[PDB]
Each structure stands twice: as structure tokens, then as C-alpha cells.
């Protein structure tokens, strides 16, 4: 919230022009979105889960965080020099994590120092802090971490490592069990002031506002659904 705790090391070496989106509502780049959002598979095409859920150990290589079925890296401590603008973690409710030292004491140096870190280490609520985080790296790429995602079972070519609510494929793949970030379902992700910056291809998603319980406590948030 304090603007001084924002990692703000932004570097437009490629001249993609992503910095304007930090300031202005109409300057998110949804070019290339219709074709890439076609890569994403609807949940219908994945195999049917079965058996007990185990947490997945892998870090599969896609680097395409724009799909709902993207299995994220687990959250760690990342240095402020890799971050541009606010880091949002999802509890499900959106929350901003500020720049800090390795212990968690707040620092106020714009992330311009080497001690400045963003400690995103996630343990899923209700006991933990959040489910996942999203942020823009210093050269204009969306980065996301969280989970670990779930082994839901299945057999074959197609098999879902679920990072969201996947009730369709397995009855117990709830968001509390497998939620790994902003995607609440294959259809909805949490709306927050920089969703269009981080997820420009959700531009046409319609805003439903949502009420949602994670371990007793109710969460009161707007979701953008297709």
C-alpha cells in the first residue's frame, strides 16, 4: 500500500511499452490474445480424475501463465530487482505484498537495493497466508507462483495437474485443496486493479462479484469470468 514498498525496477529494453499500463487503464496490450487464448484447453478435454489427491512435485515448462490450467512454480523469496510494480497474492482475496528484508521487516527503498526481497513463500490457507501470487518481471513478462498443484489421477495423453477448482474431473479438487493463484475455476480469475496488465487476454471477461468460503472465513471478492 505504501508506494515506497513497491519493487519498481522496470526495464523496457525490448520496447514493448508495458510501463504505461502501470499508470493508465487503456494501455494494456491484448494483441496476440485471440490466437494464444486458443491454446488453452477447456476442462472437457482432460481425463477424468480418480483416487486420492496428492500434491504434484514437478515444475512443468510452459511459461504461458495466461491459461487457467498452467501449473505454477512454488512460491519462494525473489529479489526485488526482478519485479516491476505491485505483487498480488490471492488469499483468494487480492493482497499486495510489500518489499522487505529476508526476515520480513518492511523496507522502503523501491526495491532498488540487493537486500530488498519479496517473500512470497506460500502455505495454503486457512492456516497459511495465500494460495499464489502474480507480478510483472523487470522486462515485461507476467510471473506467477503458488500451490503446489494437485495430482487428480487420470490415465493417458491427457491428464490434469489441477491448479484451480476442478470439481468436474475430481469431486474434491476444490480451490482450498488445489487453488494455486488467481484462477478460481477454469472460467474465472480474481479481479484486481492490474489483472489486465498481468492477464491481458481476460479483457472481455465479465465481472461477477463472488462470495466464497475458505476454512470458515468468508472472502468477499469480484471474479472475472468468461
Amino acid at each position: 500500500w505504501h508506494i515506497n514498498r513497491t519493487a519498481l525496477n522496470c526495464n523496457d529494453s525490448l520496447h514493448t511499452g508495458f510501463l504505461a499500463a502501470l499508470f493508465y487503464t487503456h494501455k494494456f496490450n491484448a494483441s496476440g490474445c485471440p490466437e494464444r487464448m486458443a491454446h488453452c484447453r477447456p476442462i472437457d478435454e482432460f481425463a477424468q480424475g480418480w483416487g486420492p489427491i496428492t500434491y504434484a512435485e514437478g515444475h512443468g515448462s510452459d511459461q504461458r501463465p495466461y491459461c487457467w490450467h498452467y501449473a505454477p512454480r512454488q512460491c519462494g523469496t525473489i529479489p526485488a530487482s526482478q519485479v516491476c510494480g505491485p505483487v498480488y497474492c490471492f488469499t483468494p482475496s487480492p493482497v499486495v505484498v510489500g518489499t522487505t528484508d529476508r526476515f520480513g521487516a518492511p523496507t522502503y527503498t523501491w526495491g532498488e537495493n540487493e537486500t530488498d526481497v519479496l517473500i512470497l513463500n506460500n502455505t495454503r490457507p486457512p492456516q497459511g497466508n495465500w494460495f499464489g501470487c502474480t507480478w510483472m518481471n523487470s522486462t515485461g513478462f507476467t510471473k506467477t507462483c503458488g500451490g503446489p498443484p494437485c495430482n487428480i489421477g487420470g490415465v493417458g495423453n491427457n491428464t490434469l495437474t489441477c491448479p484451480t477448482d476442478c470439481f468436474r474431473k475430481h469431486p474434491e479438487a476444490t480451490y482450498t485443496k488445489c487453488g494455486s493463484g488467481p484462477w478460481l475455476t477454469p472460467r474465472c480469475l480474481v479481479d484486481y486493479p492490474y489483472r489486465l496488465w498481468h492477464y491481458p487476454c481476460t479483457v472481455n471477461f465479465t465481472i461477477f462479484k463472488v462470495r466464497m468460503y475458505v476454512g470458515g472465513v468468508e472472502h468477499r471478492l469480484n471474479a472475472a469470468c468468461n
Epitope: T6, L22, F23, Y24, T25, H26, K27, A30, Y194, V203
Partner: antibody, heavy 125, light 113 residues
Amino acid sequence: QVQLVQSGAEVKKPGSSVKVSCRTSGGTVNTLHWVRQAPGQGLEWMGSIFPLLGVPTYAQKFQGRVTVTADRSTSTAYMELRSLRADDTAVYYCAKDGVGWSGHGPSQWSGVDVWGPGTTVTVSS
Amino acid sequence: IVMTQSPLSLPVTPGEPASISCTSSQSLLHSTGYNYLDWYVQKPGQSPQLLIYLGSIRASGVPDRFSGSGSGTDFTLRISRVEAGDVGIYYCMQALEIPRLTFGGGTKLEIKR
């Protein structure tokens, strides 16, 4: 009620460099701009900078002979045009848009609503 | 994006209305639902000055007798009771490509005698 106070006129000779200054007074800005106006000709954007980030953008016509920089502590931004030519005599306007990043979300465009008084730069031998 | 303007010179009898057109090489209408075209006036001797932003909103100190309309690629600035004060050059400018601005060649408002 941000004001933009600019450095005074400059009589330069062909080949040399000028560094025009612009100081935001009484608030913050999303982005400074440099727009110039050759005698009798129109308005030409040259470059701009987000003073928060300190990252500038340049028009192609001046790429390589202009640099825009923004000193944070003094709330002063500079524009330096080098290899000056008689073609470069003009009034040099810095102009802003925005009040600065709210730190919570993007803002809506509200125009280039504040212009400085201009800097007259003469290039002649 | 290229901003061309018409007319270049506009002689206007005082109190009579005035109108000046701007066209954009590409549509200035955005996902958000706003047209990102501004209108500026430079009165002789003075700095450029903002008149109208986002197609239709008029800036601080700007009277109701200035109105901007238009959508996509065709826009118009209309001035209803032209006065000797209004003389100057009127510029449109697209803001779809900020930080980069691109201005039109300008339209000269001129009192007819």
C-alpha cells in the same frame, strides 16, 4: 495546480549541445513530455519520461541525438539535444499529464493538461 | 497514427459558430469504451492549452460553448459563439499511443471581417 518552470532562452551555435530543464512545482506527474515548435511550423513531440520509473521514450526523428532524464530529489527533468542545427531553432515546451501513480491502480487519461511557458533555443553562427 | 485536420484556415464572423474536423489513420476507440482524442488550442503568444480530452470532456476553465464530438476515426470540435478571444491554432491529438503523442498540423481560427 502543478506548475512547470523551465530554463531560460539559449543562443547556441551549430554543432553544440543544449540542456533544457523543467521542474514540476506543487505536485507529481505521470509523464513529462517534450514538444517543440519551430517558427511557423506546428507542434512536434520529441520524447517523454515517467519520472517515477526514470524510463524515457523518444520520437524516431530525434533518436540518438536527444536524451531525457528526470532527477527525483529536485523534481527536475532535463532534455538534451546535441549536434544542433539551424533546423532546431524553436520553442521547447515541457508538458505533463497525470498527477502521479496512486500506488494502488492505473488511472484514467485526463489530457496533457499543464504546459510550461517554453524555452526559446536559437541555433546560429 | 497520423492526425490530419480540416480546414487549415477558418475565418469566422463573431458570434457565428465554428467547426473543425480531425481524422485518425486508425480507430481511436478502445476496449474501455472511450475515444482517446484530445483538442488543444494555442493562442498567439501563449503555450498550448488543453481544451477537451477523451473526445468530449472539456478541461478546466473551458466554457460550455466548446464541444467535441466524434467516434472511431472522425472527430469534430465545434465552437458556438466565436469571440475575438478564441483566435489561435487548434490541434487535435490522439492519446491511444501514450507516452507517444502525435499532433495534427493545426487549424487556424480567424475572425472574419
